[PDB]
Ligand binder design. Structure first.
Ligand SMILES: O=C1c2cccc3c2[C@H](CCC3)CN1[C@@H]1CN2CCC1CC2
Ligand SMILES: O=C1c2cccc3c2[C@H](CCC3)CN1[C@@H]1CN2CCC1CC2
Ligand SMILES: N[C@@H](Cc1c[nH]c2ccccc12)C(=O)O
Ligand SMILES: N[C@@H](Cc1c[nH]c2ccccc12)C(=O)O
Ligand SMILES: N[C@@H](Cc1c[nH]c2ccccc12)C(=O)O
Ligand SMILES: N[C@@H](Cc1c[nH]c2ccccc12)C(=O)O
Ligand SMILES: N[C@@H](Cc1c[nH]c2ccccc12)C(=O)O
Lengths: 384, 384, 384, 384, 384
């Protein structure tokens, strides 16, 4: 006349101790099977070398104290028991560095032969060793080691619920619209021993993830291209205009402030720097070379009033690779000498300015070729 | 002589087990009805793809162990029972990524036929997939899936307390002065099965929200308009003044620093970039074209002392589309030749400067027409 | 021979149920009186529309199960009982969006007729609708609604312990050295009904606060005044010096970077923008007008070698509102003609420069008058 | 035959009620002695007016229900009892605004006459009123008020364990390498009464701390000195070089960006601003005066072709405080007149430039004297 | 017929008190052995002087109430007991300033002679005194003091489980890819006494860590080298070009903004500043000296029309260490005098410009030598 569930709960949970490992022969370990499904990757901190994920975790073990015959209890083959009323193994990850706030599941399933099932979502704060050598295109290899913190392998052994193929090829619920992309989850069993007669069992899950580089394209490639374009645009100013130096120094200031602003989002580890810093400093070196060429050309064509005539070797190479009446007379001769001195100085300045113009055009063509070579090399290395 | 409430509490909560599903026949599921009301949208994080809301949640189910006759207990038809004294279903959202700090409601209502009522406010930290293609005007479509985490559909089935129309058209308490605007909450029932004989029941609520674009108008449209205005103002400087290049390069530096400052508040997802980046780079391309035109006009009108007379075709097109006495004599002739050379060089420079002025006016008119076309196109696309 | 307190505790807390509403007749509600005192305003977030306060809260109700005669228990008229041993009503605020960490008070006072007293400090995280139209001088009007989350008005009714005058005029412990100033706390009772036969009681407290504007004076008024001063200082540079344009563009760049830096501390709501943005854009428009006037005056006085003589109407208005011997002869005449051409061009340039100087002085006086008018209008609007 | 500790624990904790104030005569209060030792000052927030400290707190009271004779229990004079098994007073600070995460001490000492001892470390989040008028050198005066939150003075009275001298002169464990320096902790007892017959006891501890100014020397004094030095360096540029104005405006831009960058680390309260802002605006006013002097000197020495001869009073003061033959003849006379006009204009320009040079040297000496006076005044005010 | 584990649990945990120190003779202390292994260093905050680590902690003590004979209980020599069922000592660190979220280990091992084992991971928030005098290369010396917070040395004494050599030379699990490198963990025992007859036992662990300097190389050495390079590049501009001053002032502005940007990542303590600030201000002083030299050379070579001939001593040193006919006649003489005056002024300007060029080359060579000396000194101090 009982509801056939109160009867079973009173038959099971009475005279039951939740501190004893549920075995009738203490020489047998409780094999705890484990299954893990990745759901989301909340935050990957490259500075502190931590990893915040969120998984759906579930275990199975045999409780030799929760067993009954269904025909006695109205063919009841399973029921739900509160989690704080039975023995639960202490399986937790070795690579913890904090505690994740996870919802509390208060019930567990129990079958008529002792098979307990415990579904529980977990938020993991794992200390992973991150390598950012190829920053925009890197494949991180983090590990999760499920082990019993106190019991040896003669008490709790850890197996896998599903086959390793199904665990590796499972992306059914992963939030894929984020920054990271899940490649696989590779499980592996290992008997880790600290001493003799003290061997622990553990199950390592290798979470292999890959970053999406288009998150940083608009933030890394656009300003450099824009600055190189405005540089090759400003390279067409006349060298004697007195504004090319200001243009180049303002451009270098802008590139410097952009570099020191974007260096914050760029991660950094104490072991090494990403390979993009080399390309950034190569671009800034190209800008500095452009500035130095501008300064040299300005130093050439400047009218300093100390200019001597251009040497003949340089001329060849560059410009082929490109009485009262007597008193009146002497006064007029002095005036003509003054005017001729002025005209000769102007002609020397003109010759120097033409030489400078030719050299500037040559160096501009060389710089353009070098920039195009560097750009096509970068494009090929991106496209391979 | 008892207070008629102590009697009922002792009659109900004695011999009561809070771990057993309250059914007299285990072949019947406990239908849990659900009602949800949105109250506030605390934070929408487009970077980590999370959503923090705050709802008012309430459920109803039938407890076949809490039943009495009112006439026996002084016509008491309902009372309040502590929540930790009865069976509560484990209904929680599938899309959790954290735990929200919510107040604890310690009591529940119970009627004389078993109908339990459980009001409880919840703070949800939900992993939603956000699409920001149309950033200032986007309609996000997030989902909340209420399901039983352990019980199958033969134990706990989920229904709706109100009709779907009332759930869709309910905005009675929503905090509307924020950044997001609630459009509707659309419920839908689905029997989600992982395997055969293992089918779970769930209730999906589609929270459809829309961002208010005036939050970002004063921060996105004002600086671009101001910079375009000062650009068309500075376009009136004389090209031979030697300050137009400095003006344009300072303006481009200011636009660049504004761009890299405002790019932080602009969100970004690893799948795509918003459509406002295209308009921003089009504006910066217009600025770069203005700079290039200024540089070209400066290169034309510069007095380089190497200037040859302007060709006749260009002239036509542009400027129509717009003895002691003999010794004294030869000395005076040399002086006159010097002066005539100077005057001829000045005249050539004047002709080139006039050609440059005409071309500058033409290109300024063209640039103004292009800017007005782009502005009216943007205004129409905003106003449609 | 007992300590006369153990006796009373055993007489009261034995056969006592902490889940039953303490009434002998279930047709009577437990009138819970409420008193609230503001202590501090921790943080007002205008972006997320939340409000973090800290109050001293206390309630009073009648427990008909905790009653005794003092003469029996050695004239004991009151004692302290742990809070987890009696019935406590579930009074909490409707406008919660989080949980505040508040100290736990473990004891309550009980008198010999059932009057229980429960002092408890609370930290509130309340969702308030903030209006920042007059940002530096605004009077926020936030609300706190104390209501029973589950019980109707036939079970728990809410009254006020003190008179509304004393609750409105109480600032005894408020931390007044902060940014916000408390004006009053106005209570109001309302019977809020969702349906028929389901009416809830609630008590609304309107916390009316006012911001102190001197917190932002040194951060908002000082840079604008400094920039206007340096602008009217730089307005005295000669227009033909070739540095006035650089001065004005550097000043505009500085004002722009200051604007985009201070726009972060300036709050913003999706419904509207504060009225200070209008004054800021008016100041930046004044700066842009100064830049345009400088550009115009520079365009006037520039020596372009294309300058024609100033028209007579403009002149009037502005400048009144302010043989071998024959061969020698012809050679000397040609020289004199060259010199006369140069002198005539210089004279035309001088006339244009004088006209430009006069117009610059006139426009500078006009701009100074306009700036003084705008400043005195702002001062009057602040002082009223 | 018992371990002589199980016996005593069963003799004490049996028939013991942890909710009753441990007195045999309810007309006697439980005098709780208090001792406090500062350990660290974690964070002082001048914006929100909070203070986060960490103290070592300990109390002593007499429990008249925990008493025994040592000779009966094998000369046991003291033992440890779990804290959740006895009565603990509710002593907490009045100035709380949050809850501090502190370790939990599970045991307390009890002597054979009832003296209980309760050591416990506490993290305090206290609302302190901060005065930052003298920001780099300020002595904050914060208060901690230990009082019983519910019990009046007839139930719990608060005394001091050590003498006030030892509490004032105790710096044994204070972390001294931080930013703040502890001066003293001054205790004071006060009987605070809200009404008649309702008087509470409290113990106020005045934590008097002092900031170390060398934390901000390298961040406040270095850039101002550097900018003043580069200003007095750039003051030596020739006034007619056309670069002094650019130098001064770039320097003012740099000082402005430094000011608006360092104004963030500078705290600010709604009641007043620190006294360092006055010195900062005095320095910026000196820079603006230098800019105005440069502009004036530039306006003096500029060659505008409108220059009239320098007036004689200014000259005195400044420069003492520092036929075919007839046709040929008339043509030569016209040429000589042109040349003489040019030479006269050049001579007038030279005179004006010399006057400007003299005035510039005089004003530079005056500015240097003023800067040295201001610097020595600041040094003396720092050194007193 | 019992499972031989339920029997042992009922034999042990029945009649067991978890509040009594497990000794049969109260005159014997419970020697608690301790072992500590560092696992990760999460965050070192130099501003607030805190240290966040994560260790693997384990203790051992003898429980004289948990003892049995294996042959009686089926040769069971050990089992797991819940932690909340036995007596656990209150060993915690003295240098706490917060509470670290650590996983909860619910079981402990117990042998058949009372040896209990308690493994537990801990997250420590320790107040450490940090010295950053040699910021990029510093060896921090932090301390962890494990002591019993309440029990004296006659109740709980603390020993070491492993030998001090094994504790010092253990780096088996340390996360080494981070910013800090673990050198050793040196334990030391000390009997700390506050009074007479009140002596406590404690165990100090000196965690000695060292920072990796390559984390800050790319952020500290690169911009300074780049700016020095562009400075020595710009040092080649002609001094009379009128752009060298603009170049130098723009470079100084860039260096200043870089300095004030990187000064944030540079830590700072109230006791002293790191030694890198001296080198940074030496570099900025070199830049200021370059600016002053540029200003001096510009002041020398400027054509001011007030230039007097260069003195002979300076010349030697520098330039060796490097009637109608009569009317026509007088008119021609006046013209020649004008031209000769102009030519003489030009010649004086040329002489001054040559002197300035020579001095500029000399000072540039001196500055280059000084820069190379400073760079090689820095390189040697880094390489030693
Ligand atoms: O929980 C809820 C709630 C949740 C879900 C749906 C609905 C509600 C009611 C309103 C009806 C629809 C309001 N509430 C509150 C609970 N208490 C009584 C009325 C409200 C304020 C306090
Ligand atoms: O809670 C409260 C409180 C709350 C609401 C209203 C009022 C109060 C009293 C003052 C009277 C009005 C102060 N308090 C404190 C509680 N204890 C005794 C006096 C105060 C300090 C400790
Ligand atoms: N050249 C490679 C670069 C690359 C590596 N990993 C990637 C991931 C995404 C995009 C590009 C890459 C391609 O393929
Ligand atoms: N042209 C559209 C732009 C738009 C889409 N969604 C919006 C929401 C708010 C304001 C504008 C919009 C209008 O209508
Ligand atoms: N003109 C008003 C401005 C104002 C409104 N509210 C304020 C509060 C504080 C100071 C000024 C104000 C005065 O009075
Ligand atoms: N002139 C004072 C300035 C000062 C006040 N308080 C200080 C504290 C530290 C250093 C300096 C000060 C000295 O003495
Ligand atoms: N000249 C030293 C500098 C130094 C000290 N500690 C270091 C640690 C790492 C690298 C360099 C150092 C070497 O050796």
């Amino acid at each position: 006349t009982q509801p056939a569930l109160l009867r079973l709960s009173d038959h099971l949970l009475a005279n039951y101790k939740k501190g004893v490992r549920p075995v009738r022969d203490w020489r047998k370990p409780t094999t705890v099977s484990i299954d893990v499904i990745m759901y989301a990757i909340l935050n990957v901190d490259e500075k502190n070398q931590v990893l915040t994920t969120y998984i759906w975790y579930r275990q199975y073990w045999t409780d030799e104290f929760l067993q009954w015959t269904p025909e006695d209890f109205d063919n009841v083959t399973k029921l739900s028991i509160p989690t704080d009323s039975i023995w639960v193994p202490d399986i937790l990850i070795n690579e913890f560095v904090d505690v994740g706030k996870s919802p509390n599941i208060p019930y567990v399933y129990v079958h008529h032969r002792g098979e307990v099932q415990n579904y529980k979502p977990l938020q993991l704060v794992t200390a992973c060793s991150l390598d950012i050598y190829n920053f925009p295109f890197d494949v991180q290899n983090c590990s999760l080691t499920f082990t019993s913190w106190l019991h040896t392998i003669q008490d709790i052994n850890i197996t896998l619920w599903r086959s390793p193929e199904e665990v590796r090829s499972d992306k059914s619920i992963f939030i894929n619209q984020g920054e990271w992309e899940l490649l696989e989850v590779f499980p592996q069993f290992k008997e880790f021993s600290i001493d003799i007669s003290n061997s622990y069992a553990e199950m390592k899950f290798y979470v292999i993830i890959r970053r999406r580089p288009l998150f940083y394209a608009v933030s890394l490639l656009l300003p450099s291209i824009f600055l190189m374009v405005v540089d090759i645009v400003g390279f067409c100013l006349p060298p004697d205009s007195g504004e090319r130096v200001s243009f180049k120094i303002t451009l270098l200031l802008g590139y410097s402030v952009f570099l020191i602003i974007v260096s914050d989002t760029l991660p950094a580890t104490a072991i090494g720097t990403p390979l993009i810093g080399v390309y950034f400093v190569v671009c800034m070196a190209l800008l500095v070379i452009s500035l130095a060429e501008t300064i040299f050309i300005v130093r050439l064509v400047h009218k300093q009033d100390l200019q001597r005539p251009v040497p003949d070797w340089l001329r060849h190479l560059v410009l082929d690779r490109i009485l009262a009446v007597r008193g009146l007379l002497q006064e007029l001769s002095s005036i003509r000498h003054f005017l001729e001195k002025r005209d000769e100085m102007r002609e020397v300045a003109r010759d120097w300015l033409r030489v400078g113009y030719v050299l500037d055009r040559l160096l501009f063509r060389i710089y353009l070729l070098a920039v195009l070579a560097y750009s096509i090399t970068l494009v090929t290395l991106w496209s391979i």
